[PDB]
Ligand binder design. Structure first.
Ligand SMILES: Nc1ncnc2c1ncn2[C@@H]1O[C@H](COP(=O)(O)OP(=O)(O)O)[C@@H](O)[C@H]1O
Ligand SMILES: [Ca+2]
Ligand SMILES: [Ca+2]
Ligand SMILES: [Ca+2]
Ligand SMILES: [Ca+2]
Ligand SMILES: [Mg+2]
Lengths: 1162, 146, 147
């Protein structure tokens, strides 16, 4: 009974299906694909579908229907056509394709997007970069392209493309533009690794700020780093590698380099062989790497393939890169020396002495590694094992290995810091005006076992998602309300509770954990317990016994917790948080190392509990301060599948990301919101430099007004607010066109605006004269309506005053001519003359007496009707006496004929009399009917006044109940997000019970069963389900389309107010007092309505210029109203109630009996 | 002109009844006012015009063949009752079947050829025109013409 | 066809902007009177009060713009549209010679109150003249009107 729709699905996310049933809270949908399969699907999860599946639109806000399902389908169609990038009104969804799409990243593509307003070209990341540059040149404030997405979504690659565009379209050909991009592979080698979710996994979040001068030319760059994951350097997972540099060094070092650095196969270092040891290489590169490098496990298993990375090739690439960025061979050897020093420092394994005195000693095998580490890091053997064996308090084996790993972590952290500083000084800058800074943070990541690094990464994801919420939803709705545009405000899931949970003071997790560390006896269990103590009832933090996944249920209360991030819930084992908090490398190590003899080591470290968490909190607060100070353009990268396969697009994961990231809410907001904003004053002064003096005399908003038609723009595009002028989505090619500063273009627009304005100054006056003429002719209209008024008033005055007599004396004149006719036959007869003579004189006495009585004075109609009523029986007595005389006088030929024709004429008279009496009595009884109905509505008004019912308290509690229900709806949505993330983790690891009845039966058992009470609740249910379905068609409305009027607006909009009588009614669709005041202007004419019983039965709408649209129940009920008569308030409307048969008259002149017969057939 | 014979009979009949002079002539001043007697509906302009053309001879009185012609071209161009009801519904505020009696009084008195108080009182009382219950103008219209 | 097009409604919005001198959005019989008597007609306060009470939802005396469009609404004749447009042109054309000079536009602009210089009215005629003969005719009005 309609068009197919979208429905929930486990794997493809959302699926295509037709509606079979209309339940109370579900639409029982039939998946067409798997015929026979069937489920109930909630109201808030069934969505309308696109007319044709093959259409793909570049901007989703230009879709017919706007909702999550159509967004996911648009992406799915575009993805298979090799167009991964998509728009949502200013936000670019970039689905990562997992394969090098050709002919779109070459310089010829970068050559096209320069200066093109987004929308004039296919969506692409370069268009976001160019919009960023355009808004930085025009608005003259810095901007940040906040790339966000999950771990494995395509953040680093999109950042590289942004930098490549910004340096190859807006550089000047120096070395700096080349360096800004070629710096990325070096940092890539030194700070990225193979996670489970990604092969090139950014373990540090960077903010590459391409600084610009006043002249909008690149001046340099500045690359910052936040939270280099430092636990990897020492311990690595089963299928994870350390940072690439430990491997590119091994697989790429030459013969002399191998001899100097004392390298070997990666399995020979403890810091590496605990994880994946296999290089990355293609066939040619695999053959290229020398056999002595490859570990035996690499022979046993083989190289893994990534579309972009290749270990040996990457080492040659980064050698060229270091040479380009100005790293001489000496600095290169220094970096590789520190790397090899970290590598070796793992092999020094500490043994305990034979006596249980805490003697920390070393093996015989570590002796060679001891010398190698001493030489590499510029240290002395004596100093080294004195520093490590004791602290000189002797240590234990656990503390000794902790010490080794602490030194390794500190050295690698400072090595990364020095690499970043050298890269920064590759492209220096003193002063600049603006910066375009991409932000590639390590995205959300969750694993089977999560530790402090995952917790902080997800915390940074939390803050950046809160920033996105504030920038695109909170700030935008605040601005919209300041302009009061009446956009239907959309509610977003605020993450502020989770931020407050992590970063607070005396109640926050990080500060509670600092408190834990500053106790003399630190304890992980104590920190977990304290967090469960200070956050007893908080919504976000959950003891894992109350989890969804069974894996985390094993961890009991005082060892871990689960936090519902925006992306979902992640179980953080609080094992070893207390140690990973600390940045206090003991004085032993710092002393050990500052007296190293190598210049490079000293230059490294020349740059007491100090929490990593508080340091990271400060870092992120500073980063967010920079971001808030700037504008922002957003890219949402989406990972298609959790299996790294190309050309595979799993709906469930992508839709979980879309709901988690708030992109769905942004679509629900931009369904009516205006992406492009602008100040009136900016335009006014922007054109005043060229726009002449006279045209400026307009109001600034007037001159902006005439501007938009010089372009011939549509009035469905803009909506002027208080201090801003807006533009709908999908209209950028004209907004940036308005922002053009071309003097010839501005002169052309000046001339066009001048002409449109002088046109309007014609139009105003001409239409004013037409309005004057139309009012004058409305005067003529009302004057002549009133003259017809007066005509009828006077005629009816003289119709009850004279005309009654005229009718009565028409009857009397009939009788008089009849007496004239009788007198002849009276003379004809010859027996009993005298009594006939008495009769005839009596009758003529009646005649002339009544003629005098009428002509003399005024008499009522009823009086003369009585008089003629008597004289009728007088003529009857005449006739009867004539029959008896006939029976006693013989004039056969004369009398038989004459008398019988008198009898016939009398009978025809009497038939007329019965007819007229019936006519008049029916008219009277009709007002005996109407007057009673008018008194009925008056008495109903009186009863309503006497009742004095009050519902202010009722609605007062109803508002609170609605707010509470919204709260539980948000809670249910959060629980759905949590269960979706849990499923993702599981996938990664591997008297009348009519409430049940259908809409179907109800429509059928409404149209057959005559068991009274059946239709009590049947009609009631069927109408309740109908309200639910109209609600579903109301929330899911085509945006360019208006609402559906199945009843006049007056009837449905009386809802401000809260029997078998076949009450008929009639209401204008538009009340003629509101004729031109209907912005909808959709349905016009008379809404006839038969209400039979508690619910509508039949209806009708004669449009002014259309054939009729009849309905009836048990058949067309989708255009018949569902409202109860009382809600219609038609009892409270005056004169709506109508005559029974008047409906049935315009009914039958419009196929009444015919449409009824059709309903009988149906 | 041609017309039904019974209607000519009624015309002669009404002409005869109200012959106060008794010489076979109707004086116009009452003639037009009672000429309204039949459902034909003249204005003040039309009654004025027929006075002028009847008094064009300067007599001030009429005779029945003239009156027959009078009513001939009077009925020849007459207003449809639907047009009357259109005029009634011009003033209907909300299309609710009722015009509030004062608005109605305002219409008759204020607009056009002024109509006097007594007629509107005849409306309010005799014509079932409730001041509280605004006239249901269809009902009036009916009773007005029928 | 009592309803109007959206474009007709917008151009009437401009017209009301000319009635609504102060821009408050509401007008009482005073302004209707001043402008209408200025533009040649002679009404009386009684029937303007009648029309207002016809389109005064609150009976306050002031007329909102949608009520103003509604007060225009009428069961017109099909020929009445051309009839009233020609009466409008004659309102613009005092002599009724079918062509407006600079002087006639001058006078009408003065009466409605928009302050114009004698070069501006010449510019008005020259911009409204598609045929460019120097003075405006009727189908030129219509093509200006809908435009
Ligand atoms: N536009 C693109 N074209 C081709 N491959 C891409 C693109 N974007 C991402 N990738 C793929 O993504 C992988 C790296 O993902 P990355 O961007 O490093 O994730 P993250 O930024 O989350 O660390 C690479 O193997 C690369 O092939
Ligand atoms: Ca005003
Ligand atoms: Ca008002
Ligand atoms: Ca002229
Ligand atoms: Ca011309
Ligand atoms: Mg990354």
């Amino acid at each position: 009974d309609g068009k197919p729709v979208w429905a929930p699905h486990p794997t493809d996310g959302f699926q295509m299906g037709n509606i079979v049933d209309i339940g109370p809270d579900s639409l029982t949908i039939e998946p067409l694909n798997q015929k026979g399969k069937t489920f109930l699907a909630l109201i808030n999860q069934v969505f309308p579908a696109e007319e044709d599946s093959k259409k793909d639109v570049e901007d989703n806000c230009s879709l017919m229907y706007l909702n999550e399902a159509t967004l996911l389908h648009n992406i799915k169609v575009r993805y298979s056509k090799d167009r991964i990038y998509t728009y949502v009104a200013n936000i670019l969804i970039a689905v990562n394709p997992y394969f090098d799409i050709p002919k779109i990243y070459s310089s010829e593509a970068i050559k096209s997007y320069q200066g093109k307003s987004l929308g004039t070209r296919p969506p692409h990341v370069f268009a976001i970069a160019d919009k960023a540059f355009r808004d930085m040149k025009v608005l003259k404030m810095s901007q940040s392209i906040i790339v966000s997405g999950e771990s494995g979504a395509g953040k680093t690659e999109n950042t590289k493309f942004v930098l490549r565009y910004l340096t190859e379209s807006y550089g000047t050909g120096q070395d700096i533009d080349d360096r800004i991009v070629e710096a990325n592979p070096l940092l890539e080698a030194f700070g990225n690794a193979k996670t489970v979710r990604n092969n090139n996994s950014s373990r540090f979040g960077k903010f590459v700020e391409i600084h610009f001068n006043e002249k909008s030319s690149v001046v340099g760059g500045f690359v910052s780093h936040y939270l280099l994951e430092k636990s990897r350097i020492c311990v690595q997972g089963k299928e994870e590698r350390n940072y690439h540099i430990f491997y590119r060094l091994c697989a790429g070092a030459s013969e002399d380099i191998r001899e100097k650095l004392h390298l070997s196969s990666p399995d020979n270092f403890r810091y590496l062989n605990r994880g994946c040891t296999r290089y990355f290489a293609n066939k040619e590169t695999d053959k290229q790497i020398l056999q002595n490098r490859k570990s035996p496990e690499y022979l046993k298993a083989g190289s893994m393939k990534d579309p972009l990375l290749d270990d040996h090739g990457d080492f040659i690439r980064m050698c060229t890169a270091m040479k380009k960025i100005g790293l001489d061979d000496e600095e290169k050897l220094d970096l590789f020396r520190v790397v090899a020093g970290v590598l070796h420092l793992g092999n020094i394994d500490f043994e305990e002495a034979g006596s249980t005195s805490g003697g920390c000693n070393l093996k015989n095998k570590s002796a060679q590694s001891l010398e190698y580490c001493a030489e590499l890091l510029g240290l002395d053997q004596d100093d080294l094992r004195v520093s490590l064996t004791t602290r000189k308090v002797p240590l234990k084996v656990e503390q000794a290995n902790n010490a080794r790993d602490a030194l390794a972590k500190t050295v690698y952290s400072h090595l990364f810091d020095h690499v970043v500083n050298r890269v920064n000084q590759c492209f220096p800058f003193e002063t600049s005006s603006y910066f375009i800074g991409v932000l590639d943070i390590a995205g959300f990541e969750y694993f089977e076992h999560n530790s402090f690094e995952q917790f902080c990464i997800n915390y940074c994801n939390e803050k950046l998602q809160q920033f996105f919420n504030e920038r695109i939803l909170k700030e935008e709705q605040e601005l919209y309300q300041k302009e009061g545009l009446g956009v239907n405000e959309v509610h977003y899931v605020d993450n502020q509770d989770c931020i407050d949970l992590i970063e607070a003071k005396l109640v926050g997790i990080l500060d509670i954990l600092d408190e834990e560390n500053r106790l003399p006896q630190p304890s992980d269990q104590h920190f977990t317990s304290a967090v469960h103590q200070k956050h007893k009832d908080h919504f976000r933090l959950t003891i894992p016994r109350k989890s969804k996944l069974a894996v985390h249920r094993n961890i009991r209360d005082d060892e871990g917790f689960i936090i519902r991030h925006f992306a979902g819930a992640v179980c953080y084992e609080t094992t070893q948080f207390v140690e990973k908090n600390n940045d206090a490398l003991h004085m032993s190590l710092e002393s050990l190392i500052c007296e190293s003899r190598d210049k490079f080591i000293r230059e490294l470290f020349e740059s007491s509990f100090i929490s990593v968490g508080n340091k990271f909190k400060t870092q992120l607060n500073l980063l967010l301060d920079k971001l808030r100070s700037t504008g922002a353009s957003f890219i949402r990268c989406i990972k298609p599948n959790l299996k790294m396969t190309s050309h595979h697009f799993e709906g469930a994961q992508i839709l979980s990301q879309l709901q988690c990231s708030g992109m769905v809410s942004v679509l629900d907001l931009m369904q009516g919101g205006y992406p492009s904003r602008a100040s009136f004053h900016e335009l006014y002064n922007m054109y005043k430099k060229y726009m002449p003096d006279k045209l400026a005399r307009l109001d600034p908003r007037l001159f902006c007004k005439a501007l938009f038609k010089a372009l011939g723009l549509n009035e469905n595009d803009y909506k002027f607010g208080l201090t801003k002028v807006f533009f709908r989505p999908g209209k950028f090619a004209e907004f940036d066109q308005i922002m053009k500063s071309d003097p010839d273009h501005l002169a052309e627009l000046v001339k066009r605006v001048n002409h449109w304005l002088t046109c309007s100054r014609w139009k105003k006056v001409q239409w004013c004269s037409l309005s004057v003429i139309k009012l004058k002719n409305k005067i003529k209209y009302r004057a002549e309506a009133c003259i017809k008024m007066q005509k009828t008033i006077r005629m009816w005055l003289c119709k009850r005053r004279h005309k009654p007599r005229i009718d009565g004396l028409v009857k009397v004149g009939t009788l008089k001519k009849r007496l004239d006719k009788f007198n002849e036959v009276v003379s004809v007869l010859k027996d009993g003359k005298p009594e006939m003579n008495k009769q005839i004189k009596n009758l003529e006495i009646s005649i002339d007496t009544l003629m005098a009585k009428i002509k003399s004075t005024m008499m009522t109609q009823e009086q003369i009707q009585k008089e003629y009523d008597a004289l009728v029986k007088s003529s009857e007595e005449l006739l009867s006496a004539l029959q008896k005389k006939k029976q006693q006088e013989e004039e056969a030929e004369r009398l038989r004929r004459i008398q019988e024709e008198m009898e016939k004429e009398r009978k025809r008279r009497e038939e007329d009399e019965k007819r007229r009496r019936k006519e008049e009595e029916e008219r009277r009884m009709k007002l005996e009917m109407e007057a009673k109905r008018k008194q009925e509505e008056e008495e109903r008004k009186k009863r309503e006044d006497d009742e004095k019912r009050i519902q202010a308290e009722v609605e007062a509690q109803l508002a609170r109940q609605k707010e509470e229900e919204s709260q539980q709806q948000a809670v249910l949505e959060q629980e759905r997000r949590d269960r979706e993330l849990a499923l993702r983790i599981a996938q990664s690891e591997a008297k009348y019970d009519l409430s049940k009845w259908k809409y179907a039966e109800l429509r059928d058992t409404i149209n057959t069963s005559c068991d009274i009470e059946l239709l009590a609740a049947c009609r009631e249910e069927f109408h309740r389900r109908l309200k639910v379905y109209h609600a579903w068609k109301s929330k899911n409305k085509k945006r360019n389309t208006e609402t559906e009027q199945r009843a006049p607006k007056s009837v449905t909009d009386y809802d401000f107010a809260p029997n078998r009588q076949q009450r008929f009614f009639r209401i204008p669709f538009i009340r003629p007092a509101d004729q031109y005041k209907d912005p909808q202007s959709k349905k016009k004419g008379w809404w006839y309505a038969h209400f039979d019983g508690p619910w509508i039965a039949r209806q009708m709408e004669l449009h002014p210029d259309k054939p009729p649209i009849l309905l009836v129940a048990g058949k067309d009920d989708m255009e018949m109203c569902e409202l109860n008569l009382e809600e219609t308030g038609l009892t409270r409307k005056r004169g709506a109630e109508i005559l029974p048969r008047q409906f049935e008259e315009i009914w039958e002149r419009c196929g009444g009996i015919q449409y009824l017969q059709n309903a009988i057939e149906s | 002109d041609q017309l039904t014979e019974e209607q000519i009979a009624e015309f002669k009949e009404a002409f005869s009844l109200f012959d106060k002079d008794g010489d076979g002539t109707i004086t116009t001043k009452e003639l037009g006012t009672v000429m309204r007697s039949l459902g034909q509906n003249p204005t003040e302009a039309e009654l004025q015009d027929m006075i002028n053309e009847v008094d064009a001879d300067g007599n001030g009185t009429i005779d029945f063949p003239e009156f027959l012609t009078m009513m001939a071209r009077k009925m020849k161009d007459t207003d449809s009752e639907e047009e009357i009801r259109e005029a009634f519904r011009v003033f209907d505020k909300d299309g609710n079947g009722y015009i509030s009696a004062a608005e109605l009084r305002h219409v008759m008195t204020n607009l056009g050829e002024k109509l006097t108080d007594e007629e509107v009182d005849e409306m309010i009382r005799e014509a079932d025109i409730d001041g509280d219950g605004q006239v249901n103008y269809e009902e009036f219209v009916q009773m007005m013409t029928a």
